[PDB]
Design a binder for this molecule. Structure first.
Ligand code: FES
Ligand SMILES: [K+]
Ligand SMILES: [K+]
Ligand SMILES: [K+]
Ligand SMILES: [K+]
Ligand SMILES: [K+]
Ligand SMILES: [K+]
Ligand SMILES: [K+]
Ligand SMILES: [K+]
Ligand SMILES: [K+]
Ligand SMILES: [Mg+2]
Ligand SMILES: [Mg+2]
Ligand SMILES: [Mg+2]
Ligand SMILES: [Mg+2]
Ligand SMILES: [Mg+2]
Ligand SMILES: [Mg+2]
Ligand SMILES: [Mg+2]
Ligand SMILES: [Mg+2]
Ligand SMILES: [Mg+2]
Ligand SMILES: [Mg+2]
Ligand SMILES: [Mg+2]
Ligand SMILES: [Mg+2]
Ligand SMILES: [Mg+2]
Ligand SMILES: [Mg+2]
Ligand SMILES: [Mg+2]
Ligand SMILES: [Mg+2]
Ligand SMILES: [Mg+2]
Ligand SMILES: [Mg+2]
Ligand SMILES: [Mg+2]
Ligand SMILES: [Mg+2]
Ligand SMILES: [Mg+2]
Ligand SMILES: [Mg+2]
Ligand SMILES: [Mg+2]
Ligand SMILES: [Mg+2]
Ligand SMILES: [Mg+2]
Lengths: 77, 119, 108, 168, 110, 215
RNA sequence: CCCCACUAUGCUUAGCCCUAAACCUCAACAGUUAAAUCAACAAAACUGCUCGCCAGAACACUACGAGCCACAGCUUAAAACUCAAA
RNA sequence: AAUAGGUUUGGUCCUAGCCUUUCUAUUAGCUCUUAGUAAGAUUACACAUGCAAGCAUCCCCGUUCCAGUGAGUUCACCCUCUAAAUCACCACGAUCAAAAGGGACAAGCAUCAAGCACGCAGCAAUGCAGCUCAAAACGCUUAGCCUAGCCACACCCCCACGGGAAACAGCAGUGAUUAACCUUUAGCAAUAAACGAAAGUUUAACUAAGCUAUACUAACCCCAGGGUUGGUCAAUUUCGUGCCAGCCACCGCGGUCACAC
């Protein structure tokens, strides 16, 4: 692809990007679906993020991790 | 190759040969090439029906949840796969495209009947 | 040698392979400067047709012209390949018959 | 033939037969032994036969030897916490020395089994890629799936050369 | 306990004491010769901080990594003199020795 | 191993940063527009088609404030796009204004204020975005009471939604594996997921600015 | 090559020069005489350990560089062209 | 170098080089039916022309990516620390990953053997004289690499304020050059990327085509060529030539019965 230093094409100087036509009924329904969909996906992302954080803390300062750390320290002595 | 900004994305990397597409589901930096370096492979997707008439999709759900929990984004085709699997809700455009297809075929059925009626 | 000595010297080092008259290339383009005949070393006897060409690399070299009869002249273009003429000392290049100005041998 | 006495020591098979894999705390292992004396015979065979096996399994642990510095042989381990472990080896055989250090500072068979399992998780059988990393390169290798076009030409209907031709 | 220095604990031989409060230590490690599959010593130099200037050329010392290097080449400090040159104390018996011979019999203190 | 210093790189890096602060373009240059062609003479780039009608009809914020005492501190300003999109009052209460003195009509600059979007007011003032847009209207003084009048409607919003079919089946299968015999349905909590309208004023402080390169 | 004469030189002193078929062409140290004793010849065949050295012939006790009280020297020491042998 | 083979001599044994037989790639000669697939300038030399970055109610964001090349070349890996970035917003967190610190990391030449400030202590002032090196420092030469990819470069002056000067090492294409030689096609339908709240828009990435025995797979009623035929090494009849013309990878053949031209 081009870089910001490459010049603009001359066959595209007068190009005007016209926006699509809108169907009011479908536009409104689709807008509400995206809100509900993204609210549910954000609720799922929050749970997955909490699981990742719970597993990291558990492996660091969990009851089974601190218990195995004391056992190894006792066996050493 | 440290990129300026960017983020991890779960997306489809195209494999296979000419006229024989095959996708690998990978977590990779969004700035990396489509089929280049990735962080982890999270599954695969064969879009061509097999001998049993099935499209096979493998999903490493344990690792998919891990990478989403680490801040990974999802490409639109990946979101639709998870919707079809029941892991995510159906994407808003899978629902809307289905409705568009119903209206399209409702007009064709109406045109066909009007032609037979004229006959 | 002992194990200590083998460890200290390391793995053997192949002599850097020497490039032949083609300078490690399949063929070279040349311009004919003059034609002449050479006598082979004993016990062979003949007047082997050769020529001096200016290679595309700027170097001048003698080249053997294989086959019965040729029509090469000064200022003509030829393609030269490797392979020494066994009984012509110093001749390590061969003209390719049927390329550029050097045509194929005429039948019988 | 291979040079030196007991050339079996200079083979990968022999070096991998060591059963001592130090815990992560071990950082240095010094060996003090005497070149002569019947009571230091086991320590000399330990340096001759076992030190290579220990170093091979523990590449990042410093091992340094010292000759004829004290009247009797001994091992000393320096741990990351700063603790030092002295092991008197006079009168012991090289096999008894290996079994001793394995008991006090070596990883047990359970800890080693677990580590090997966590490695197998890195090569998932279901992943596709180069042979260096994966079992199969493409799904076309799985029986029942559409095979590769390089071996079985696809039907004309599944080829873009004729999809565009009919559409165009 | 963390440290940016790579070598945390290393034993070596003092080979120089000409720098102020710094001992130059030679550290040897066993490195496998891939072709011969024989281990050979590989030596490396370390500068160790010696605040009391107690190191003598030839003694065996234990070096501890510093939290951060105190100089361009000084990344360690003298943690302990293992074997003082010509004044070794047998760790097994705690008695002074001269090579493979005792200077004080272990039977002296029972 | 010691990388050779690259002094010309550091020198040029500082000279560029300096020239970007001493030759920085002003708002009157960046945000000027040719109302006949609807292009910015600073870069020659046209505006999007959906903005053409408003660029010829609506005013920029500083076009309104440049006509008021103290540049209109304390006044309420709303946007035509908000008036069309929402029935609840949306407006800024101005607290600070930095006019672009280089503009002949003082119709460019920055502004700060307290946001009231759809009847809900924020606690602290912040910088206002889209100050250069042709979209602003000044609320008359004799209309402030009737314009700001708002009664909060009951936030009767859903609290929990189900899990997707597969996620639900896996959560339930995990319960039964661990001996749990509960029949309660797994539910996603969406109370904490507050969905802002896409036209909610973003943080202007964290927004970039066009670099100097006048055409 | 044979005969005669005579000089540098062979000697002493004080400094250099640093070479030899300086070869008993057989490295130092430790050990063996049993096994397969061993291409040939030479001065029987081997083991452990260490250092030095070698890898077709010729070019070459050479060229160049470097060092040296050496200035037609010594030490270290290549390559190109050539042959299918030596 | 192997299961090895040919060749030193009047002859034998030993040693030894060279070559033969195997498998790839490029180029050349002669020859060539189809289909599918993969791959595809000699040149960091110079480039005509077209296209390769937009999006979007203005702000911004993107054009720092992708794609290209291999000139230069121990910036690629591990650890410590810690920015920017993602997780809407905080995340005392995770993920990802710079700068900085520690460690590790190509080849040849030692006829490159010494480098010449290359160290340490001290709050500072300043003091000490050290630091690297035959376990190869310092130096010269060669080379992209350890390939799910990575590093480096982006006309040159290592850099790019400035200067020389006016840039295809983006796609297609051209000139010169080399033994080395793909179309100045189509489409954003799939995937990926940018932007948008979104329907969507854009993209010479990519996808689907074009060209070429360079390779793989399969096939064909008709359609086979190329090279060899003294030994190594599978396989020659009759003539012509007469140490001439010519031939061989090695040993050799040709001086009138040449299985070697
Ligand atoms: S390798 Fe799988 S389709 Fe070709
Ligand atoms: K002859
Ligand atoms: K000599
Ligand atoms: K002799
Ligand atoms: K041979
Ligand atoms: K934008
Ligand atoms: K690239
Ligand atoms: K390169
Ligand atoms: K450069
Ligand atoms: K597309
Ligand atoms: Mg011959
Ligand atoms: Mg006299
Ligand atoms: Mg006398
Ligand atoms: Mg003598
Ligand atoms: Mg000796
Ligand atoms: Mg030789
Ligand atoms: Mg001599
Ligand atoms: Mg000489
Ligand atoms: Mg000289
Ligand atoms: Mg003979
Ligand atoms: Mg090159
Ligand atoms: Mg941060
Ligand atoms: Mg870094
Ligand atoms: Mg030497
Ligand atoms: Mg020289
Ligand atoms: Mg070097
Ligand atoms: Mg190069
Ligand atoms: Mg160019
Ligand atoms: Mg540059
Ligand atoms: Mg091009
Ligand atoms: Mg080609
Ligand atoms: Mg196009
Ligand atoms: Mg193609
Ligand atoms: Mg005849
Ligand atoms: Mg013939």
């Amino acid at each position: 692809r081009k870089t910001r230093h490459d010049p603009l094409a001359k066959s595209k100087i007068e190009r005007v990007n016209m926006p699509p036509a809108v169907d009011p009924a479908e536009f409104f329904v689709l807008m509400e679906r995206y809100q509900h969909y993204r609210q549910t996906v954000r609720a799922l992302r929050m749970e997955f993020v909490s699981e990742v954080q719970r597993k990291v803390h558990e492996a660091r300062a969990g009851v089974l991790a601190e218990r195995k750390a004391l056992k190894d320290a006792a066996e050493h002595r | 190759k440290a990129y300026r900004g960017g983020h991890l994305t779960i997306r489809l990397a195209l494999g296979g040969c000419t006229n024989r597409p095959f996708y690998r589901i990978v977590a990779a930096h969004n700035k990396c090439p489509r089929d280049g370096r990735f962080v982890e492979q999270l599954g695969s997707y064969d879009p061509l029906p097999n001998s049993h008439g099935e499209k096979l999709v493998a999903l490493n759900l344990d690792r998919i949840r891990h990478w989403i929990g680490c801040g990974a984004h999802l490409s639109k085709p990946m979101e639709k796969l998870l919707g079809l699997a029941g892991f995510f809700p159906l994407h808003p455009m899978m629902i809307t495209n289905a409705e568009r297809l119903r209206r399209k075929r409702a007009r064709e059925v109406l045109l066909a009947s009007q032609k037979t009626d004229a006959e | 040698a002992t194990l200590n000595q083998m460890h200290r010297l390391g793995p053997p080092k192949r002599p850097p392979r020497k490039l032949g008259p083609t300078e490690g290339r399949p063929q070279l383009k040349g311009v004919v400067l003059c034609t002449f005949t050479r006598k082979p070393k004993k016990p062979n006897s003949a007047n082997r047709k050769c020529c001096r060409v200016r290679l595309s690399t700027g170097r001048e070299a003698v080249c053997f012209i294989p086959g019965e009869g040729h029509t090469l002249q000064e200022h003509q273009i030829v393609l030269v390949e490797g392979g020494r003429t066994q009984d012509l000392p110093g001749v390590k290049l061969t003209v390719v018959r049927g390329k550029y100005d050097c045509g194929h041998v005429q039948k019988k | 033939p291979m040079k030196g006495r007991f050339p079996i020591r200079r083979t990968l098979q022999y070096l991998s037969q060591g059963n001592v894999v130090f815990k992560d705390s071990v950082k240095v292992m010094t060996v003090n032994y005497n070149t002569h004396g019947e009571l230091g015979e086991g320590a000399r065979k330990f340096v001759f036969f076992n030190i290579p096996q220990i170093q091979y399994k523990n590449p990042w642990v410093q091992i340094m030897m010292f000759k004829n510095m004290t009247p009797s042989p001994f091992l000393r381990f320096y741990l990351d916490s700063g603790e030092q472990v002295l092991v008197d080896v006079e009168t012991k055989s090289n096999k008894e020395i290996m079994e001793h250090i394995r008991k006090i500072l070596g990883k047990n068979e359970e800890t080693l089994r677990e580590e090997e399992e966590e490695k197998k998780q890195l090569s998932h059988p279901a992943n596709f890629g180069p042979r260096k990393y994966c079992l199969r390169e493409c799904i076309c290798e799985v029986e029942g799936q559409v095979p590769c076009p390089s071996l079985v030409p696809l039907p004309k209907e599944m080829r873009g050369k004729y999809k565009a031709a009919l559409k165009a | 306990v963390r440290s940016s220095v790579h070598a945390r604990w290393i034993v070596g031989k003092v080979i120089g004491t000409k720098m102020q409060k710094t001992a130059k230590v030679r550290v040897t490690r066993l490195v496998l010769d891939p072709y011969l599959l024989k281990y050979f010593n590989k030596r490396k130099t370390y500068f160790a901080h010696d605040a009391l200037q107690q190191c003598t050329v030839g003694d065996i010392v234990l070096l501890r990594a510093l939290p951060v290097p105190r100089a361009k080449h000084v990344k360690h400090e003298l943690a302990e003199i293992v074997f003082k040159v010509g004044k070794v104390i047998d760790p097994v018996t705690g008695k002074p020795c001269a090579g493979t011979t005792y200077l004080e019999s272990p039977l002296s203190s029972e | 191993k010691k990388v050779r210093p690259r002094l010309i790189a550091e020198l040029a890096r500082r000279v560029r940063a300096l020239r970007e602060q001493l030759n920085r373009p002003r708002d009157s240059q960046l945000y000027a527009v040719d109302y006949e062609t609807l292009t910015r003479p600073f870069s020659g780039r046209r505006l999007p088609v959906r903005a053409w009608a408003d660029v010829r009809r609506e005013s920029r914020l500083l076009q309104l404030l440049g006509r008021l005492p103290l540049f209109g501190l304390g006044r309420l300003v709303t946007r035509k796009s908000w008036l069309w999109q929402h029935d609840e009052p949306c407006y800024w209460r101005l607290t600070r204004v930095r006019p672009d003195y280089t503009a002949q009509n003082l119709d460019h600059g920055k502004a700060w204020g307290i946001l009231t979007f759809k009847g809900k007011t924020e606690s602290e003032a912040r910088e206002i975005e889209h100050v250069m847009y042709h979209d602003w209207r000044l609320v008359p003084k004799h209309e402030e009471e009737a314009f700001t009048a708002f009664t909060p409607a009951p936030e009767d919003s859903l609290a929990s939604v189900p899990y997707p079919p597969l996620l639900r089946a896996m959560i339930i299968a995990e319960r039964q594996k661990n001996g749990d015999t509960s029949t309660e349905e797994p539910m996603l909590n969406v109370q904490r997921i507050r969905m802002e309208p896409w036209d909610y004023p973003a943080k202007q402080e964290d927004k970039g600015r066009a670099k100097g390169t006048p055409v």
